Every structure is written in C-alpha cells, then in structure tokens.
Symmetry: C4
C-alpha cells in the first residue's frame, strides 16, 4: 500500500499538524506571557516540556518530530521517505503559522532574533544547539539499542530545554525552522530568518551523519 495512499501515513501527517499547533500555541503563550532575562528559564522549560509532552502523546503515531531539522535529520538517517519529510515539514510550518496567528492575533521571545551576536555567530550557535537536539533524537530512538530504559520523549524534551538555556540569550533559540517561521510570517518580520533555517538544518543533517557514519555505524 503506497505511502501517499496510506491511512497511517496521513494520520501521521495529521499528528504532526496537531502536535505542532499545540507545541507552538503553548510555548508562545508562555514566551509572550506576563523582562527577558527573567523569562529565560520559564520559556526554556515551556518549550522543552511542550516537546516532552507532545512526543509522549504522539510519538507512536508520527514520531512527533515537530521540527523540520529533526525531520531532515531522519531523512539523512534514511529513516523516512522524501514524501514523508516534505509533508511533515509542510504540516509543521502550517501548524506553527496557525498557532502563531492565534497567540499573536519584536517585543519578546515569541520572535527569534539575534541579540549581541552577528548572523554568522548566530548560525553557529543555532547549528550546535540543534545538533545536540537531533543527535539526542536519533540516538534515543535508535532501534538497535536495548538500554534506553527511561522516557525517550522526556530526554528529547529536556534536550529542547537545554538548547534554549544555551542559545536563548544569543538567538532567542530557534533550533526548529518551523517554530521560527510561524512568528516571522505572522509578524511579517523575516530579519535574519535564514539564520534559523541554515543553522538548524545543517545541525540536524550533521547529527545524523556523525551518529550514523562515525560514532554508531550501521
């Protein structure tokens, strides 16, 4: 039964849309909330617990990538088809834009922005902070392992939290191109937006290649 014609495939695409819409609605709500060094841990926790909770809730349905950089890492890791990667990323961008429009209707941590770093510094920070996330996703979901006895969704969520703690005061922490894209589109502010695509996507592919080709090869 071909993937494009398969009920399970489109349920998985729907889970990604649903999960992304909730991820961005909840996280942006925390980030805009009710200045910005005070919010850093709260926001970091909100994004990380949002991913932990939605991956626990949907991961068995779609994988709960909720992140084009995770999806691209899985594609580079040959774990998903090109069709799945395209549809997941479309669903992620749509869900993020939908959530952003709800939450919103500059200023705060909703919109990723560089803070005291240049664009090329921001690209490197986003790359390393996404690299560690996609490395964790790939490693903790590696079907060869028998030693992942705790919660894989929680490990991924806490890696999202970690990426925020590291990057939020420099780039606002995107590590997720669809998460950056939603508020950019809604606010019609694409300043430095390419940083939040180039960095995370290179980091996600780099994580798949380093895990799979060097560290724990097939």
């Amino acid at each position: 039964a071909r993937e494009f014609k398969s009920k399970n495939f489109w349920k998985a695409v729907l889970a990604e849309l649903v999960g992304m819409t909730l991820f961005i609605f909840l996280s942006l709500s925390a980030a805009i909330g009710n200045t910005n060094p005070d919010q850093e841990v709260k926001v970091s926790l909100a994004f990380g617990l949002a991913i932990a909770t939605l991956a626990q809730s949907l991961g068995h349905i779609s994988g709960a990538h909720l992140n084009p950089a995770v999806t691209l890492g899985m594609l580079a890791s040959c774990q998903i088809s090109v069709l799945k990667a395209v549809m997941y990323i479309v669903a992620q961008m749509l869900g993020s834009a939908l959530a952003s429009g709800i939450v919103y209707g500059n200023a705060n941590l909703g919109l990723n922005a560089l803070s005291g770093v240049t664009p090329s510094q921001g690209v490197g920070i986003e790359l390393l902070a996404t690299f560690q996330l996609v490395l964790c996703v790939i490693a903790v979901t590696d079907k060869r392992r028998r030693d992942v006895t705790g919660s894989a969704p929680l490990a991924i969520g806490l890696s999202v939290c970690l990426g925020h703690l590291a990057a939020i005061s420099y780039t606002g922490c995107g590590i997720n191109p669809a998460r950056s894209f939603g508020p950019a589109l809604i606010l019609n502010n694409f300043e430095n937006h390419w940083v939040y695509w180039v960095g995370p996507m290179c980091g996600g592919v780099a994580a798949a290649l380093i895990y799979d080709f060097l560290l724990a090869p097939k």
Copy 2:
C-alpha cells in the same frame, strides 16, 4: 459483582478523594505561599509535581484522575462507567473544597481568574491547555502501547506543569474544574467560573475524540 457494590470501586473513589485533597492542599499552599510573575514557575512546578507524585502513588488504585476533565475524557474514551465518572467528580470537588477550606481558613494564584483576556479568550486558552493534558493522559495510559518505558505519572505531571507555564499569566491555569471550584466556593467568588468548566471539559472530550477517533483509532 456490581460496581456500586464493589469494594475496589469505593477504594478507588476514596483514593480520588484522598489524592485530590492532598493535591489541592499542597498546590494551594505553594500558590499562596510567601509578586505573581515571580511565582509563576514555582506554582507551575508545585501543581505539576503534585500530580506527578499523587498519580505515581494512587494511579494503580483509581487511575489518579484528580481532575473532572480527565475523568470526562476517560468517559468519552469509554474507559470508565458513568457511575465512576460521577463519583470521581464528586470526590474531586469534595476533596478540593476540603483542601481549600484548610488552606484559606482575590489576592493570589489560589483563585483562578482572568488576567488581560476576555472570557471567550480564557475559554479557548483553558481548552487548549486542558486538551494537551488529557491527550497526554489518554495517550500515555493507552494499553495497546508497548513503548511507554519511562514514568507515565511523571509525563502527566510535567504536562500539568506545561499547562501552567502556558496559561497561568492569562487565566491562572485551571485545566481542572474541581481545582477551580474549591477556592471559588471557599472564597464565594464565582466570577468567570463557567470558563473553568466549559474550557477544560470541552478540551478533555476533544482530546479523547481526536486521539481515539482520528489519530490512533480502535
């Protein structure tokens, strides 16, 4: 042995009363503690760790719903009888009113209240923030799964924490009609109280229908 006449049933109802009384006593104690943007993470953590701990302690006895919206989601998911849902919700409301009376004897995060949102905005925020909670409960307790290797009680507690991080600065975060009801009754302040019933109950039913009828169908 009919449910109404069953010892295990009434032990489960008692666990819900006991667990709800402790959940609200401990969480309200943290929320009233010893202004309100400073408390947000502390309160969010207190409610989430309270649910994580009591679900770990009682979940094998009653399911540790401790939440009419979770109970209604389980009923919509056909996992509990109508009799169980009624008695659980009565036990939850009673436990919350009892705890509230102990803790108390406006002002703070004890009493859910709208803050800078309209009632219909508050209903939508409560709905989405409860939806993600009941989706997590239903998904993480789904008996078909074999992949929930970590702590299901902790996942649910962290989802409670997440719901607070998202909603607390807008609605005070109810996501739990009995949790809202206790302080409302004790303080005799039912202003906007219907928000904290309509939102969470619709969210809980919506979560059961979306999980069970669309995403991971039977």
Copy 3:
C-alpha cells in the same frame, strides 16, 4: 544469620549514615549558599535532587530512607524490623549532625523555623507534607506492583521537592526529623523542634496505615 550479626545489615546502616551525611551536606550548602523567597525553588530543588540522587545510588543497599519518617512508615508497614528502624534513625541523626557541623562550622533556610504560622498549624503542614512523601515511597516501592516503569528514586526525590514547594514558606519544610535535628543541635536552637518530629512521624505512620489498610490492602 541474625540481623544484628549480619554483614548486609551493617552495610545498610552504613549506607544510611553515608547517604544522610551527603544529603544534608549538599542540601544545607545550597540552602545557606549565596533573600529567602528568592531561594525557595533553588532550595526545594536541591533537597529533592539530593534525595533522588542518593536513593538512586544507595536504594538497593539500604532502601535509602534517609528520613526517620520514612523509616517509621516502613516499620508501620511491617517492612523493616524494630532493630533496623532504630539503627537507621540513629544513623540518620548522626549523619545530619555531622553534615550540619561541617556546613555551619537563625538567618536562613538551614534551620527549620515557623514563619507566620502557629506551632499547631506547623504540625499539620509538616504532617501533610510528610504524608505525601511517605505515601509516595511506600507506593512506588510496593513489591506487588508491576507498573512502576520509570525511576522510583526520581519519583521520591520529586515528592521531596513538592513537599518543599508546599511547606517551605510556612515551616521551612522539615518533613524529615533528622534533617531538622542536625541544624537544631549544631545551632543549639530547639525552638518549635517538636513540630518537626510530631508532624512528620504522624504523617509517615498515617501514610502506611492509609495505603496498606485502606487503599491497597494486603
């Protein structure tokens, strides 16, 4: 081989001494650190992560009670001998006094003290905040269960954290008579000290009786 003459017994007593000394050294170091509403989450986390870590490290050797109220609950639950309970509590008091003397050599959260509550209010707060802890310990270690798939040490540590979030602004949060005793002895300040014995010990026994005689009977 009689318990008093058994090598495993005295290794377990030694684990309790060692674990208690580290628990109090690390937690008091955080609590005295470098005013007190600002510290509440930090201190709450330090005590809870200290118990989570030491129970993960020693729980298979002694049970890692590290708490006379847990030990008394286990005795009321008929899971340890009277001899073990006595020696554990002596080891816990000694370890706490030793650690306190190291850390120290009023003022702060090192010494449990009532803050804006009467002694009888403090007894009830300590009782409920210990009750939920010992209920969690007993429930999560219940050998009949097969559903505790996550970390039992982490669940207990997070319950310790929860008890702090609830009680710290009222009583300083003892929920552990040996933890209260060390700084009291070192500071020679036993004001209201009986609160921190009566409350937690009644709570621990109450938790064993309610779990074992009512909720999940043998």
Copy 4:
C-alpha cells in the same frame, strides 16, 4: 584485537571528544549568557541537562564520562583500562579547551573560582560534590543491578545539577577537572586551579572505593 588498535575504542574516544565539546559549548554559553546569584539555577540546570542529554546520546558508545573524575572513578573501579582513562581524559581536556575557545573567543560562572571560601574549604566542597556524582554514575551503571528502571543518563545529569546547586556559590562548581581546565587555559587564569583537580579526583576515587569495597562489594 588490542584496544589501541581497535575501531570501537577510537570511536569511544571520539564520542568523548565530541560529547565534551558540546557539553562545554552549551553549558558555558548558558553560564556566560545574558547577576550571579540570579543565574545559579539556570546554570545548574544547563550543566545537568547537558550531561543528561549527552550521556543519553553517547553513553552506549563510550560510557559518556565527559569528566576526568568519572573516568578516574571507573579506573579505580577496574571498569576501564589505563589506556582508555588516559585517552578519555586527553579527549575531555581537548574538547573543553576547544569549546572554551569558541565561546570566549574573571567576570562570570564560565571560570570556576573560589567565592568566600579558602582553597582547602574549596577542595572539600569539590570533593563531596564530585563524590556524590561519581557515586551515582558507578551505582546507576552497576551491571549487577536489575532495579534501575528509569533513565540512568537523567539520574547522572540531575546529580550534576545537584552538585551545582550545592557548590556553585562557593567554588563555581567544577566537579569535573576538564570542565575547569578549558576556561582556565583560554583565560590564562590558573588561580586556585589545583583545587578543581585535587578535590574532584579524590572524590571520584573515594566514590569507587566506598561503593565497591564497602557498600556493594564484589
């Protein structure tokens, strides 16, 4: 196949280099971020979640020691060869120096420094705060156990977090000689640096001896 000539050995050494570089890049980024009592929980969480995430990601490849004191404890515990300990520590020092150079290019929590304690007090604080970490690593990875049902990487990360909560306001919390070494080398400031070697290494060896020779003997 001799260890020095083995592909798996050098993949493990590479994992340590990679994991250490990410651990220090991410943690130092959080610690320098964007004064120092405000940062304590954020920094404590960043270091602990960094270890939790990288140990979850790499632990099956190298053990994810990421810490000369853990490596020396494993050597004292006879779980790794002398060759492995040397190469791991070289890889850890190199990765930390590399990351430090990236992040940096006094002042803050990047560079471990004594704060209101003497060098010999700092040595004892570093020793106890490392002791509890290496005790946790050794205990939670003990292959004889069957009761470690949760996440071992998360337990170790939370122990790292705990060590920070205890030690950060006194020594900046090294508990990891390569983590101290990187910023010292990059900033060319080795003031009190021996504290951050002597304390943690003695603590790590002490943890192996106490676990293995006293508490849970072979």
